[PDB]
Amino acid sequence: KVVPLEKALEVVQSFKISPGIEEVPIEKGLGRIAAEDIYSPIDVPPFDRATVDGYAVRAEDTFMASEASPVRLKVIGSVHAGEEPKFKLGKGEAAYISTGAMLPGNADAVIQFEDVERVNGEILIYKPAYPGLGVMKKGIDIEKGRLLVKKGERLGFKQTALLSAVGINKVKVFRKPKVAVISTGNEIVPPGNELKPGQIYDINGRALCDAINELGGEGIFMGVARDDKESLKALIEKAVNVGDVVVISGGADLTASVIEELGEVKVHGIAIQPGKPTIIGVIKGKPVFGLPGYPTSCLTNFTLLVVPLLLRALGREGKIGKKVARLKHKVFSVRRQFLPVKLEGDLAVPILKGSGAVTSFIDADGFVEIPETVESLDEGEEVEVTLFKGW
């Protein structure tokens, strides 16, 4: 019973994963996803600071200053980096102050060191200053209450430094959605083991787990399941207990039947190429996906069906990377299909069968969706390409 992609998409949208929220020290925030917006808790700078070395003054005391009749101010103190001024300026009084230091009480301007003449513990001013001169006022860099980090934003070194800059040492991030991954096939064996003729090593299990780790979740490899009822049912049961989501690869009706008896199968077959036999169900409230065994097909279906679910769980609901490009060759195609392509600059190079399953996986940078109609893609004509994340 094949159903359109849109329906399968609506079904996944109906699912909702809530990994929960946790607080981690700021030094452990790198790579995590912010669970909610974060607004600056303080003004930056947190006080009026001098922007040059010179003399803090009450601007008004310099209004009558002229080259002919300079104003004379008495230097009564000083303010250096890190100090909280414990005095204020009276009329006709000034204070030496270094760049970055806090202005003493009543001061509203700083006159550069070179623009005054020092005499007997006093200074001569020949030009009137104005409030704000030589000063970075409190909150002019970043106003208290300003949005610093958005919900769903990944914390890179700039974000963690920013939070540190405003005194934040604990941040609320989404716990990593756990995805239990299973590889199915009588020919599959885990790496490290010796191969017997006829067997191959798992590739999708590791690929899925790490892609999941990369997007922000926690990929847990449950292992390899033989293509039979007992083996598969036992592993799916364990997967359902350790993860919030279960993903199985091994296609290209046993898995569907196992899911059907452990829970419910919402989708069984999708009107697309590849992924025709793709399964989507629910066991004990947890989404379960049965994807194709062919590497690029598993990757394509993973991106189309599982990624949106995971992104939404991380408040990234709608974070798919797309890029336009022109084909390097003509493409013939029947049913709605997604063609794996390699991006060699601004041109999309269609990937072929004979190149091999692994080589195709390596070369696939993304896919181009060709309408259920059909026709030919011809050369160039620019096509939208959904990329397979990155790195």
From TrEMBL:
Residues 180-313 form the MoaB/Mog domain. One of its GO terms (cellular component) is cytoplasm. GO terms for molecular function: metal ion binding; molybdopterin molybdotransferase activity. SUPFAM superfamilies: MoeA C-terminal domain-like, MoeA N-terminal region -like, Molybdenum cofactor biosynthesis proteins. Pathway: Cofactor biosynthesis; molybdopterin biosynthesis. Its EC number is 2.10.1.1. One of its GO terms (biological process) is Mo-molybdopterin cofactor biosynthetic process. Its cofactor is Mg(2+). It catalyses: adenylyl-molybdopterin + molybdate = Mo-molybdopterin + AMP + H(+). Keywords: Magnesium, Metal-binding, Molybdenum, Molybdenum cofactor biosynthesis, Transferase. The keyword Metal-binding applies. The keyword Glycoprotein does not apply. Belongs to the MoeA family. PANTHER family: GEPHYRIN (PTHR10192:SF5), MOLYBDOPTERIN BIOSYNTHESIS PROTEIN (PTHR10192). This is molybdopterin molybdotransferase.
